[PDB]
Amino acid sequence: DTKEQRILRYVQQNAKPGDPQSVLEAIDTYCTQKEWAMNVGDAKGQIMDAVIREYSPSLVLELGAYCGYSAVRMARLLQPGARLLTMEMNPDYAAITQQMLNFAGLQDKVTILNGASQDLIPQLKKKYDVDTLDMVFLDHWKDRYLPDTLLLEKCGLLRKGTVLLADNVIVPGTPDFLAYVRGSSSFECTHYSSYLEYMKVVDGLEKAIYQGP
Ligand SMILES: Cn1cnc(CNC(=O)c2cc(-c3ccc(F)cc3)cc(O)c2O)c1
Ligand SMILES: [Cl-]
Numbered sequence: 016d017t018k019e020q021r022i023l024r025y026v027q028q029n030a031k032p033g034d035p036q037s038v039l040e041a042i043d044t045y046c047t048q049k050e051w052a053m054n055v056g057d058a059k060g061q062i063m064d065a066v067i068r069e070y071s072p073s074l075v076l077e078l079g080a081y082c083g084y085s086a087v088r089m090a091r092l093l094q095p096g097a098r099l100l101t102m103e104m105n106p107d108y109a110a111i112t113q114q115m116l117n118f119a120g121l122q123d124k125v126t127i128l129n130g131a132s133q134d135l136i137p138q139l140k141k142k143y144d145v146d147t148l149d150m151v152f153l154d155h156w157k158d159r160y161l162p163d164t165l166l167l168e169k170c171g172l173l174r175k176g177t178v179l180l181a182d183n184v185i186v187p188g189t190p191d192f193l194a195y196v197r198g199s200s201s202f203e204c205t206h207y208s209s210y211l212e213y214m215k216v217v218d219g220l221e222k223a224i225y226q227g228p
């Protein structure tokens with residue numbers, strides 16, 4: 016089997032069904048003790064939690080679900096009725112993410128879409144009945160952060176106050192995105208320094224709040 020299958024199985028056998036916190040703890044334990052994986056992790060996860068709680072977004076888009084760690088993290092803190100859409104281009108990972116959400120009991124709050132974000136973003140308004148997004152979590156291929164941000168704007172999915180939160184702006188880094196948002200009058204940016212998941216290596220999140228045209 017794959018690392019991702021092994022992570023899912025560990026959760027199923029070491030967490031309590033319907034208990035998202037136990038799911039996060041199980042993944043963190045597995046990835047610290049057994050096999051590293053590119054989940055956002057606890058250090059950066061705590062920063063994400065603080066941001067989610069500050070904004071209480073009604074509609075969140077995540078780019079890059081992977082195994083669903085961040086989707087569980089965010090969805091567990093959403094208010095009743097609030098929703099998460101998460102995109103994952105790898106079908107095997109999309110299936111892991113669905114099963115992870117199912118186990119966590121969060122499947123009614125989250126929709127996991129299998130496809131490249133550049134292909135799905137233009138369908139959000141008509142197919143998924145989206146008006147604008149309250150928050151976007153970027154965690155997919157690092158060279159897609161900038162083009163997909165520009166695509167979100169083109170498609171009319173950003174509003175004044177839409178919070179972009181980007182993982183991995185130090186490692187692996189996303190230099191074009193980071194330069195762009197920090198240099199743009201349409202974004203107000205804040206850097207949250209942290210650590211790479213499960214590693215004593217500096218990383219960070221960037222929050223970029225959209226200001227309109
Ligand atoms: C498999 N996959 C398909 N798309 C993606 C998008 N994400 C990343 O590439 C990603 C990578 C790293 C990372 C990898 C190696 C390393 F040495 C240090 C950091 C960490 C993350 O948090 C990430 O999100 C991953
Ligand atoms: Cl994650």
Ligand SMILES: [Cl-]
Pocket residue numbers: 104130131132133155156159
């Ligand atoms: Cl993608």
Ligand SMILES: [Cl-]
Pocket residue numbers: 055056057058059211212213214
């Ligand atoms: Cl961590």
Ligand SMILES: [Mg+2]
Pocket residue numbers: 053054055154182183
């Ligand atoms: Mg990441």
